Design a protein around this ligand. Structure first.
Ligand SMILES: CCCCCCCC/C=C\CCCCCCCC(=O)OC[C@H](COP(=O)(O)OCCN)OC(=O)CCCCCCC/C=C\CCCCCCCC
Ligand SMILES: CCCCCCCC/C=C\CCCCCCCC(=O)OC[C@H](COP(=O)(O)OCCN)OC(=O)CCCCCCC/C=C\CCCCCCCC
Ligand SMILES: CCCCCCCC/C=C\CCCCCCCC(=O)OC[C@H](COP(=O)(O)OCCN)OC(=O)CCCCCCC/C=C\CCCCCCCC
Ligand SMILES: CCCCCCCC/C=C\CCCCCCCC(=O)OC[C@H](COP(=O)(O)OCCN)OC(=O)CCCCCCC/C=C\CCCCCCCC
Ligand SMILES: CCCCCCCC/C=C\CCCCCCCC(=O)OC[C@H](COP(=O)(O)OCCN)OC(=O)CCCCCCC/C=C\CCCCCCCC
Ligand SMILES: CC(C)CCC[C@@H](C)[C@H]1CC[C@H]2[C@@H]3CC=C4C[C@@H](OC(=O)CCC(=O)O)CC[C@]4(C)[C@H]3CC[C@]12C
Ligand SMILES: C[C@@H](c1cc(Cl)cc(Cl)c1)N1CCC(COc2cc(F)c(C(=O)NS(C)(=O)=O)cc2C2CC2)CC1
Ligand SMILES: CC(=O)N[C@@H]1[C@@H](O)[C@H](O)[C@@H](CO)O[C@H]1O
Ligand SMILES: *[C@@H]1O[C@H](CO)[C@@H](O)[C@H](O)[C@H]1NC(C)=O
Ligand SMILES: OC[C@H]1O[C@@H](O)[C@@H](O)[C@@H](O)[C@@H]1O
Length: 1114
């Protein structure tokens, strides 16, 4: 028995048989259930029970150190088997988790131990992060609850008619009229009522309407609001994750006023740019530790011929990229003839290499066999669809391109780790897809009526393909909208599902992929006086002040400027003065540094360009020609030199300057890969996004209009989608939209509906085209776009070493020891004298630990009391809460008074005591003045009452892990501020230029009455939104329009309302590259460096707390 049990278990055939059974079961889970699937379920269950029985007989159940149930994997198998028995012998929800067994398959891929251990270690080390996350989210939720309670219910209600149609006015007749939903303003074809508010800059009502509150529901089926603490918590989490956050941003600002942008700036800065980077750092350290442990464990054959082939390949790629939709016959002929020629040259090349070089030698080389495969593919394609394989030719460019060659070599060196990570990602997605299918599949069918038109949404859980796609979209970072649909047809269970999917997929697996990439990819008198003046500090300060003031003046040139003649005169005179000032400054600098030194530096070249532009404007004005706004806007570029000289700014600017070349290389490689995908997409979807629409832009059924001819016969419109794959340029723009996950849903919808050219698209007739996007996203977004952050992380590490004076040749341990040695020097103790008998007794009582624990409990209770407030609460509830808070204030004041008596003048030696003292004073004063302030603006009352939250911030005091993380943040504050300062300056430059370019465009897409480029503030609102790439497709659609817009009339002074496609493309693409992909990623770099240092101090060295403990006994 035992002999047989042990012997059978140890056989590899046993494990292989079980694993193959699991894989077959996985296949059967995908297809819809039938009777055959049922009998298969019994067979599979029997095999699993056999395995469990054998293992128990060999080891034993639990009672010995090496028993069956002493292994976590055995625990998983045991639980799944029991649940299968429960579901067969006797709720439908428990049977989904059978799929969990598939996790075992991760052991097939060699090297899985490293990745699995890295995942487990990352999960274990996120303990200290989760508590700080929950605390910060709750604080932000309370702030938002105080700020926006009930704001999302604002609506424009028609005035009570004065004609008497509804009857003579009465209070209840007025309430009846206003409560009717048919009197709330909503544009035709809209789903949501627009928001409003009477604060300056908020949404306005049409004539005959008034902005009221407390009517109807909140946006998004009522799931988006700040009315209760729970909903506020959900909104704050969404905002921190940047999940469709521009919608909430726009709703809140339209309802409350533009100033509330401040709230969003804080949450985004602290939540997104700092905390998520803490998670990234923790994952990176986990992976690095695991890899360290694993590693420690342990004619033709002439250059000219090659050059000729290289140019032939380049020409061939150009020809392949010139294919487009509706080509003329001449273009077709040229492209086909070139293809024939290129194929002939390749064939001749192959034969020549086989003759000059030995066939054995030829086929010994890898590049040669690749070329031969291309040759046979070309012959097969021309003989007889195999045109897709033509793309292989492009990869031949890697041989002659050193950068691409090196990139591919690095990819090949450590492929096993990438295979493991991708397999884990796909297995997790598969498990979640099966679970969600079982949990929510029938809800969509049964409760279809609840959807807006009673129609099934594109994204759902009906079948395996849709479930996989929806969970994959969640992993990409979009989860809240799917969760809204799930709740709409389902229940609360949707919330834990999606959140889990977002947490594991995006914050761990994707960050682990980043860690992998990081680990792998990484007269004499005149001269004298001019020189003395130039080197003088006062002169430089005066120049900087002039530049700053004039740049600030540039911001006042908004749409209303013509209505302010005084401002017009001030601007013109300042222009003249600036022209003179620039000329004089240039002469002085030339006299000081000389011609060679002046004309060999980049900063002086920028100054010179500004001078030349202003002189050109001067002559134009003299001649009677209107000044060029673009030229006179060039002076803002003078702002970067003083900015670069700001304290602590050197590290940031030096890092960016050093990273520039690597960024260029990454962009080139990305352009190549995106070209491959763009050619493929043009071949797949060129000319297939046309559809038939009527007077209202609504797509007709394929039944009424089968194709274009019917569409035109009924006098319908055959229209193209704005984003398409008609030619390579359009494909590039569409792929940029796909990679950033902004506007991608429309593109994918058009793709999966596509049919043959000149045929009405049908819903989901080509579903498998989803695959094309998946691949692109994996190789274009998860791999290529993440190289920028790796580059910045490495370069900032080097530059910060430079700034502190550290040596590049020193090792990690030496720096740990050097830091310890530096710390040991500075340390001084102190003692407090016990009090006199009564004062001394109080001293002992307060100095006890139980006192502080009690205070912490009181802080938690006060926080809960704050969490109870909700919109529409009763007045009695309001009074009760006020009195509870008063009692808490009295207790805290007593604690402070007792500490003051106990510690006398020593009380103020500790900073936390000063914070607590200030909080106590604020609390007393507010408790006294609450009614006076409220009775004698509601917005002002809410904002000032925010100070009440100060006395729950004392909860962080006393913790350990939170203290360590906060120490890292405090150590990095200067650099984070400098990065933000640079970001704001870039935003300012873009704001003035965007105001010049797009201030008169017509309302379309994301541009409307409230959000536009008409003023500096509105431009900044939009640009802050776009710094995260949020909603850049809608802005592009607004600013790039050139259709159905009237041209400017100089004679009549009409400015025009037309957009510009080229200008909009340049503007938005450059902004996305500069901010989203570079400057923002500096945050990650900074955070990672500092966090790592602190952790290495705590683990492999000494920390300040260690010295404090040593001096505690001293
Ligand atoms: C994901 C990462 C899981 C952690 C990794 C792991 O397997 O560790 C635990 C252990 C291995 O332990 P060690 O021995 O330390 O590792 C060395 C290998 N001998 O494995 C197990 O116990 C396996 C069980 C994990 C299965 C993972 C399943 C993931 C899917 C979760 C779905 C959640 C659904 C939630 C929806 C809620 C709806 C209301
Ligand atoms: C605090 C800083 C706020 C400064 C803002 C200056 C605003 C100046 C101004 O013009 O105010 C306009 C306007 C007043 O509008 P009303 O006339 O009431 O119109 C209502 C409808 N008729 O002001 C606003 O709306 C400003 C609101 C901005 C609030 C943003 C809050 C930002 C973050 C707060 C976090 C604080 C947390 C505290 C932490 C702990 C403290 C110990
Ligand atoms: C790994 C990841 C684990 C994820 C699991 C944690 C999430 C579980 C949350 C359960 C919430 C219960 C839902 C029921 C509920 O009422 O919750 C409060 C509230 C609704 O309150 P009421 O106004 O009474 O609703 C009725 C009004 N129409 O629900 C919410 O929106 C809560 C959502 C919480 C978001 C959490 C996401 C962040 C988690 C951090 C990790
Ligand atoms: C489309 C309409 C709007 C377009 C507006 C574009 C805005 C772009 C803003 C950024 C660039 C502005 C011009 C800067 C000119 C640089 C001149 C120069 O000498 O550069 C080197 C100089 C080194 O200074 P030193 O005195 O040697 O050292 C002291 C450092 N404290 O650089 C700086 O300090 C410049 C730092 C600015 C950041 C620019 C890099 C970030 C963007 C790169 C991404 C794209 C790469 C491909
Ligand atoms: C820094 C980068 C700055 C970018 C500079 C762009 C300059 C502007 C050029 C635009 C010229 C233009 O408007 O040409 C239009 C012409 C098409 O004309 P249609 O009227 O659509 O023809 C009929 C279609 N059915 O061409 C285009 O659409 C050009 C599109 C340009 C590509 C933009 C995307 C760039 C992607 C960046 C690379 C990302 C990967 C790197 C990582
Ligand atoms: C140095 C870094 C770390 C911080 C940069 C400071 C910003 C927070 C400041 C700079 C410019 C400010 C903006 C300047 C102009 C406006 C317009 C203002 O709204 C109005 O124009 C009110 C009048 C109306 O809406 O009718 C709202 C504040 C806002 C967006 C300001 C919000 C705060 C901003 C972004
Ligand atoms: C400068 C002075 C000042 C300002 C001005 Cl403009 C005029 C004067 Cl004369 C004085 N500030 C200082 C800050 C104060 C902050 O405000 C609160 C503080 C609170 F702790 C509570 C509270 O705890 N509430 S509770 C019991 O929990 O319900 C509530 C409030 C708000 C006021 C209701 C307000 C007074
Ligand atoms: C929506 C609504 O409640 N409308 C009521 C109506 O049912 C009632 O008959 C009438 C008489 O007072 O008042 C109003
Ligand atoms: C709202 O007003 C319309 C028109 O007067 C009326 O038909 C409708 O019944 C009203 N709504 C309710 C809920 O009575
Ligand atoms: O009951 C309707 C209520 O409407 C509001 C106020 O005018 C109240 O005085 C009135 O009672």
């Amino acid at each position: 028995i035992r002999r047989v049990a042990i012997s059978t278990m140890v056989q590899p055939i046993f494990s292989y048989f079980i694993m193959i059974t699991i894989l077959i079961h996985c296949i059967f889970m995908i297809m819809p259930a039938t009777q055959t699937t049922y009998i298969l379920e019994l067979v599979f269950l029997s095999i699993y029970t056999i395995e469990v029985v054998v293992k128990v007989l060999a080891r034993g159940f639990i009672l010995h150190p090496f028993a069956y149930l002493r292994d976590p994997w055995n625990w998983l198998d045991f639980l799944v088997t029991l649940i299968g028995y429960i579901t067969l012998v006797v709720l439908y929800a428990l049977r989904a988790f059978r799929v969990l067994r598939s996790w075992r398959t991760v052991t097939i891929v060699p090297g899985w131990r490293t990745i699995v251990d890295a995942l487990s270690l990352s999960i274990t080390s996120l303990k200290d992060l989760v508590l700080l996350l929950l605390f910060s989210l709750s604080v932000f939720a309370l702030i938002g609850l105080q700020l926006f309670m009930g704001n999302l219910k604002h609506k424009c209600v028609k005035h009570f008619p004065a004609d008497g149609s509804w009857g003579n006015f009465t209070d209840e007749r007025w309430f009846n009229y206003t409560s009717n939903s048919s009197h709330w303003y909503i544009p035709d074809d809209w789903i949501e009522y627009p928001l409003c508010g009477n604060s300056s800059g908020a949404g306005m009502c049409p004539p005959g309407y008034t902005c009221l509150q407390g009517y109807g529901g909140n946006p998004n089926y009522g799931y988006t609001s700040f009315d209760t603490f729970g909903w506020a918590f959900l909104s704050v989490f969404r905002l921190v994750t940047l999940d469709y956050w521009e919608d909430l941003y726009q709703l809140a600002l339209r309802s409350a006023g533009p100033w509330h942008i401040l709230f969003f700036i804080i949450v985004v800065f602290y939540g997104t740019f700092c905390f998520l980077n803490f998670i990234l750092a923790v994952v990176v350290m986990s992976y690095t530790h695991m890899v360290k442990r694993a590693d420690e464990e342990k004619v033709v054959l002439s250059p000219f011929f090659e050059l000729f082939i290289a140019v032939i390949i380049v020409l061939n790629i150009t020809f392949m990229a010139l294919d487009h939709h509706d080509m003329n016959i001449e273009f077709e002929r040229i492209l086909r003839t070139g293809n024939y020629i290129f194929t002939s040259i390749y064939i001749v090349e192959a034969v020549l290499k086989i003759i000059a070089l030995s066939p054995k030698f030829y086929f010994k080389d890898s590049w040669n066999v690749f070329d031969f495969i291309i040759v046979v593919f070309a012959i097969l394609e021309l003989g007889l669809v195999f045109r897709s394989f033509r793309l292989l030719r492009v990869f031949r460019l890697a041989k002659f391109w050193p950068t691409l060659n090196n990139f591919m070599s690095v990819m090949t060196k450590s492929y096993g780790a990438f295979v493991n990570v991708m397999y884990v990602m796909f297995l997790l997605l598969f498990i979640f897809a099966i679970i969600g299918m079982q949990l929510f599949g029938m809800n969509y069918i049964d409760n279809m009526e609840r959807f807006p038109d009673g129609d099934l949404p594109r994204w759902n859980f009906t079948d395996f393909l849709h479930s996989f796609m929806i969970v994959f979209r969640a992993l990409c970072g979009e989860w809240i909208e799917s969760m809204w649909d799930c709740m709409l047809v389902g229940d609360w269970s949707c919330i834990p599902f999606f959140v889990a999917v977002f947490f594991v997929g995006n914050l761990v697996i994707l960050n682990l992929l980043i860690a992998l990439l990081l680990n792998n990819y990484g007269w004499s008198n005149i001269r004298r006086v001019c020189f003395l003046l130039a080197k003088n500090k006062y002169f430089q300060k005066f120049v900087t002040a002039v530049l700053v003031i004039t740049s600030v003046l540039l911001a006042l040139e908004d749409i209303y400027l013509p209505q302010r003649p005084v401002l017009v005169n001030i601007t013109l005179y300042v222009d003249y003065v600036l022209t003179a000032f620039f000329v004089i400054e240039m002469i002085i600098m030339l006299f000081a540094v000389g011609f060679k030194k002046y004309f060999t530096s980049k900063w002086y070249w920028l100054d010179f360009i500004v001078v030349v532009a202003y002189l050109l404007n001067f002559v134009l004005m003299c001649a009677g020609i209107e000044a060029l706004q673009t030229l006179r806007l060039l002076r803002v570029f003078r702002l970067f030199r003083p900015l670069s000289k700001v304290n602590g700014m050197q590290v940031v600017t030096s890092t960016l300057v050093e990273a520039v070349p690597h960024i260029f290389n990454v962009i080139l490689v990305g352009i190549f890969f995106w070209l491959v995908f763009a050619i493929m997409g043009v071949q797949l979807f060129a000319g297939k996004f046309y559809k038939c629409v009527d007077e209202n832009s609504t797509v007709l059924s394929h039944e009424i209009t089968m194709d274009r001819n019917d569409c035109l016969h009924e006098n319908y419109t055959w229209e193209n989608s704005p984003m398409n794959f008609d030619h390579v340029g359009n494909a590039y723009l569409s792929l940029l939209q796909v990679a950033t996950f902004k506007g991608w849903l429309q593109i994918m919808n058009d793709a999966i509906d596509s049919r043959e050219v000149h045929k009405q698209p049908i819903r989901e007739t080509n579903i498998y085209m989803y695959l094309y996007f998946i691949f692109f996203i994996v190789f274009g977004s998860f791999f290529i776009l993440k190289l920028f952050v790796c580059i910045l992380i490495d370069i900032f590490r080097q530059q910060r070493r430079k700034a502190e004076g550290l040596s590049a040749t020193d090792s990690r341990t030496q720096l740990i020891y050097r830091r310890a040695v530096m710390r040991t020097m500075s340390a001084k103790p102190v003692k407090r004298i016990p009090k006199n008998k009564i004062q001394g007794c109080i001293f002992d009582l307060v100095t006890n630990q139980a006192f502080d624990i009690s205070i912490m409990v009181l802080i938690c209770l006060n926080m809960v009391t704050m969490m109870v407030e909700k919109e529409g609460q009763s007045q009695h509830m309001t009074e009760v809460l006020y009195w509870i808070n008063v009692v808490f204030i009295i207790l805290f004041t007593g604690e402070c008074v007792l500490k003051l008596i106990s510690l006398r003048h020593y009380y103020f030696t500790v900073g936390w005591n000063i914070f607590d003292f200030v909080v106590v004073i604020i609390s007393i004063v507010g408790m006294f003045l609450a009614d006076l302030i409220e009775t004698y603006s509601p917005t002002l009352f809410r904002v000032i009452r925010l100070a009440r939250i100060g006395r729950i911030l004392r909860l962080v005091k006393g913790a350990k892990g939170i203290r360590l993380l906060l120490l890292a943040l405090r150590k990095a504050l200067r650099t984070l501020f400098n990065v933000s300062f640079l970001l704001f300056v870039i935003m300012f430059v873009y704001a003035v230029f965007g105001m010049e370019f797009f201030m008169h465009i017509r309302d379309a897409g994301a541009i409307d009455d409230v959000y536009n480029f008409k003023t500096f503030g509105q431009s900044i609102i939009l640009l802050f939104q776009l710094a995260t790439s949020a909603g850049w497709d809608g802005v592009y659609f607004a600013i790039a329009n050139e259709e159905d817009c009237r041209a400017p009339d100089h004679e009549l002074g009409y400015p025009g309302n037309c957009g510009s496609r080229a200008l909009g493309i340049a503007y938005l693409v450059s902004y996305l590259i500069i901010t989203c992909l570079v400057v923002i990623n500096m945050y990650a770099a900074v955070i990672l460096d500092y966090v790592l240092e602190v952790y290495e101090d705590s683990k492999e060295g000494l920390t300040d707390d260690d010295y404090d403990m040593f001096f505690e006994v001293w």
